[PDB]
Amino acid sequence: YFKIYSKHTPINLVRDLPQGFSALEPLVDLPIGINITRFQTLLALHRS
Amino acid sequence: LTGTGVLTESNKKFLPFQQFGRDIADTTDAVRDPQTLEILDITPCSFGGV
Ligand SMILES: *[C@@H]1O[C@H](CO)[C@@H](O)[C@H](O)[C@H]1NC(C)=O
Ligand SMILES: *[C@@H]1O[C@H](CO)[C@@H](O)[C@H](O)[C@H]1NC(C)=O
Numbered sequence: 001y002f003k004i005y006s007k008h009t010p011i012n013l014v015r016d017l018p019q020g021f022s023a024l025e026p027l028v029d030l031p032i033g034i035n036i037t038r039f040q041t042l043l044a045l046h047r048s
Numbered sequence: 049l050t051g052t053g054v055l056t057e058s059n060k061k062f063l064p065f066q067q068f069g070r071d072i073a074d075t076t077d078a079v080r081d082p083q084t085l086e087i088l089d090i091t092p093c094s095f096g097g098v
Contacts, residue, residue: 026065 002036004028049076051090058089
């Protein structure tokens with residue numbers, strides 16, 4: 001079971017993480033049944 | 049999930065993910081019914097000492 005828990009928070013801090021409490025609600029309970037040992041996030045380029 | 053009780057209306061604001069509820073004994077105290085998605089509270093039937 002691949003569990004994705006998510007939370008969106010309106011913040012106004014410039015650089016670091018805000019200090020506070022916010023519980024993450026479960027978003028997607030995903031039935032994959034596969035082995036995961038390594039990950040990589042995806043960014044987006046800007047072209048001009 | 050099997051059990052005995054009276055099913056009543058409830059005022060517990062369940063979150064979308066949340067389906068059932070559990071008491072201290074871990075016995076189910078509220079349940080979300082399939083097909084109609086409503087939240088039914090489960091209150092044990094009246095009992096006591098004769
Ligand atoms: C997952 O993969 C790693 C290496 O790829 C392996 O050592 C590990 O035993 C695997 N786990 C399962 C549950 O297949
Ligand atoms: C059947 O159950 C689904 C939830 O699993 C619900 O969305 C749907 O409205 C139900 N349909 C009927 C006809 O009860």
